[PDB]
Ligand binder design. Structure first.
Ligand code: FPS
Ligand code: 1GP
Lengths: 226, 226
């Protein structure tokens, strides 16, 4: 696996229900990965059930860890978020230490990847939970980008949740990021918007839209790889 | 840049104290692999400066361990930016690094920087009060902090005990789990034999305050490790 060659990804939420016909269609759309997310309140049994539903298809299935209890074996990849702009140590390192203290063994039998998370949308569920200073200036965002690239993180995930983020903030971030792979998530609900950001981000993430209007989020893939 | 993986012994100097006579010189031509300018409480831009001009003339690498942004001085071969993995204050984990990237970005790109995973393991010292470190830890805690250090990609994991010698057994176990980063052990080393004993597991032993209390004896630690 190599994220430096991805262009598009779907982020599903084990918390919501998706008709299996649609789950099947996404896995076989041409996307580069299907990431199982879950901002919060995620249950182990929903992750497990999803993992078994997507394991058959060839696309790499990724687990985005957000709760120790939700760790489940069987995924091709494991992404460990590290919220860089959190005012709380638990979301940067703390929760990460409790996890290694508890599953340090199983955390050697998988390909794990650290993501430098930058939550730039101040009004979403994610920014409230992590006590993130999510209201940032272009120069704040770019500095976090820098940090991530200093700490050397395979990924810098610029996160804007349910809203489209500033295309300029994305263009610059990309400019400082020499080694990290920039992921952009936030408001991409169609081919038009997918194209705009894909031009600046290495990878664009499409989640919510999948639930809102499936038919049209499906076009984000062809829109950036067609 | 210089490769710390090839190092074994480093001397750590306090810019807020100066060595008598030709001592800085003997120390700089001793056989040490690097001379680190660090410092406690508050370091000053004036002290760092005076040190930097003094040590930069020798072939040995000189390093600035950036404890405070206000002491960021140009002229060093390397800058160690530490993240205190066990701190309760996000400032000490990433908050500083982002400040420096926001106020001194251009200076950053033109210097060779290295992130170091600090783990303050002595709950009774300046450093721990200063960083709000959850400094009371069993080998298990410490071992887990080192695995976070590696997930996070940090090239160095600094296990620090300050004024006291650390558990020889926490050193061997952390050395154990470290697959791809260098183990710096700092703490209470003031002689050849104690030096000899920690060099068995730590990749690098740091010798700090012992050069002020007993120069001639701190100096023997180099031979005792090579
Ligand atoms: C347990 C461990 C090793 C580390 C802790 C992991 C951390 C820091 C998790 C928080 C990451 C979050 C909430 C990301 C946004 S998910 P989303 O896009 O799904 O948000 P939404 O549900 O749509 O509101
Ligand atoms: O919520 P959206 O608008 O889909 O953005 C993707 C999101 O889930 C990234 O964390």
């Amino acid at each position: 696996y190599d994220v430096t060659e991805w262009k598009h990804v779907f982020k599903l939420d084990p918390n919501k229900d998706l008709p299996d016909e649609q789950l099947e269609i996404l896995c076989e759309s041409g996307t580069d990965a299907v990431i199982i997310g879950g901002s919060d309140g995620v249950t182990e049994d929903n992750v497990l059930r999803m993992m078994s539903k997507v394991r058959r298809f060839l696309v790499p299935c990724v687990l985005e860890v957000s709760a120790i209890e939700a760790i489940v074996p069987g995924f091709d990849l494991y992404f460990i978020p590290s919220v860089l702009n959190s005012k709380n140590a638990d979301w940067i390192v703390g929760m990460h230490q409790k996890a290694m203290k508890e599953y340090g063994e199983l955390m050697s039998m998988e390909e794990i990847v650290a993501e430098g998370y930058c939550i730039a949308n101040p009004d979403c569920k994610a920014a409230a939970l992590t006590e993130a200073d999510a209201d940032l200036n272009m120069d704040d965002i770019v500095a976090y980008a820098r940090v991530s690239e200093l700490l050397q993180l395979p990924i810098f995930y610029l996160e804007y949740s349910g809203v489209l983020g500033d295309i300029e903030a994305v263009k610059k971030t990309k400019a400082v990021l020499e080694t990290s792979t920039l992921f952009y998530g936030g408001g991409i609900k169609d081919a038009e918007t997918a194209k705009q950001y894909a031009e600046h981000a290495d990878v664009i993430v499409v989640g919510n839209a999948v639930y809102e209007d499936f038919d049209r989020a499906l076009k984000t893939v062809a829109a950036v790889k067609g």
